[PDB]
Amino acid sequence: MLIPRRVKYRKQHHPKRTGAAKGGTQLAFGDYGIQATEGGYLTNRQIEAARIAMTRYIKRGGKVWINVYPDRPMTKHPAESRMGSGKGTPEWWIANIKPGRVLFELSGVPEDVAREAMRLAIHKLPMKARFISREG
């Protein structure tokens, strides 16, 4: 589970989820990758599930890059309580995903099994994503 060591402010406004990907729309480390076609919030649990799926399928070879980091904290109102009495305590850590953002990258693996591993990973994400490559 990716959790930042510290943050300046633990209670933050909800991240903007408008617009396309600000940056990181192209592969930078690996040969293949996952590119999100829809925006949304990506929690550390989802990131870990996808990473486990990719690594487990590719076994021992190849290396995986997690381009996004769940450094944005999300508070939760205390359960069964009326509205008010200040903001809640951080409960989830998310990354702000926008369309075109490359989430995961993979290298050192043949294309077919890389594609299958990316499929396994994508079936764990909460937003639509696609397999991309450096045109082979």
User: Which residue ranges make up the site for RNA (CB under 7 A)?
Assistant: 9-13, 17-20, 38-40, 78, 83-87
Can residue 8 be called a binding residue for other proteins (CB under 8 A)? no
Site string for other proteins, 36-75 (x = CB under 8 A): ----------------------------------------
For 38, the 3-state DSSP assignment is coil
* Closest to RNA by CB, 60 or 85: 85
| Tokens 């294309």, located at residue | 111
At closest approach, how far in Å is the CB of 38 from RNA?
A: 5
Residues 6+ apart with CB under 8 A from 93: 2, 3, 4, 43, 44, 70, 71, 72, 73, 74
| Partners of residue 96 on adjacent β-strands | 41
**What is the contact surface with Mg ion in residues (CB under 5 A)?**
23
